[PDB]
Every structure is written in C-alpha cells, then in structure tokens.
C-alpha cells in the first residue's frame, strides 16, 4: 500500500534487513530516558536561578 522511489527502493530493503538483525540482538533504541546523566541532572538542580527560572550569571552583583 506504500510506494517509494526506485533510486533507493532496493537500498531500503537491504537496510531493512540490517535493522531486523539489530533488533534480534536488541541493539536498537527502545525508549528515551528523562536525562542522560544523573550528575548533570543534579548539577542543574544546584544552579543559581533568577525569579524567572533562568540560570543566573555568577559574576554580577559583586
């Protein structure tokens, strides 16, 4: 029911096979985490922020 261009048709099928193999070893990305790193997540909770939530510049206000 779906149609694709001839320049990549067979190229897609070859890629299609490859991807199936990757799923056999569960090498594909299933779902996304809320944040990549716990350390960077924590650091972001310790930043000085303005009343509007934006990260604040340490240098200003003496």
């Amino acid at each position: 029911p779906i149609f694709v261009n001839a320049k990549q048709y067979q190229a897609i099928l070859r890629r299609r096979e490859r991807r199936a193999k990757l799923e056999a070893q569960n090498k594909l990305i299933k779902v996304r985490k809320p944040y990549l790193h716990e350390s960077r997540h924590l650091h972001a909770l310790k930043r000085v922020r303005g009343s509007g939530g934006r990260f604040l510049n340490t240098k200003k206000h003496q």
Partner: protein, 93 residues
C-alpha cells in the same frame, strides 16, 4: 541495549542546525527535535550501509570518503556532492 549517547548526535547540535534554516522566531517541538536526530542517524546508516555494500562488490576493506560520495549520488543525494568535494578537498591537505 546500547546507549543513547552513542546512537544519536547531540540534540543541542541538531536543534541548532534546524533553527538555522527557519525564520528567526520559529519554534521547534521536542518531539520534532528528537525524531530529526533519529532521521539523521538513519541517514548515516543508510548511506554508510550501501557505501560498504559496493565495497563488498569492490573487495576493498576500508570505506573511503569517495565511496560515501558515490553512495550519495546513487541514493539520489547528488546535490550535496558538489559542495562536499569542495569541503573535502580542503581537508585533504
């Protein structure tokens, strides 16, 4: 499985490039932000996959930058090839 940090290019890098092609005040969803980095990494595997597929035919074991250029011409990405060699050649020396 493998790590997200190894499968997709950084989303900050992607977001910056998408916004360069749009009007100044345009917004971009996080859903749209994330699927584009899925498309780009598949674009990498779709070109590299066939660049080596002809490297199978050619019985050559490393993948040259020019095999990628021919693979992009094969898959219909011929428009890119002309600026790419200009970019490529500066790096050559």
């Amino acid at each position: 499985s493998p790590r997200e940090q190894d499968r997709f290019l950084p989303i900050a890098n992607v977001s910056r490039i998408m916004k360069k092609a749009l009007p100044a005040n345009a917004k971009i969803s996080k859903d749209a932000k994330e699927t584009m980095q899925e498309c780009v990494s598949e674009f990498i595997s779709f070109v590299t996959g066939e660049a080596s597929d002809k490297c199978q035919k050619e019985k050559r074991k490393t993948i040259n930058g020019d095999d990628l250029l021919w693979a992009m011409t094969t898959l219909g990405f011929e428009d890119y090839v002309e600026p790419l060699k200009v970019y490529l050649q500066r790096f050559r020396e």
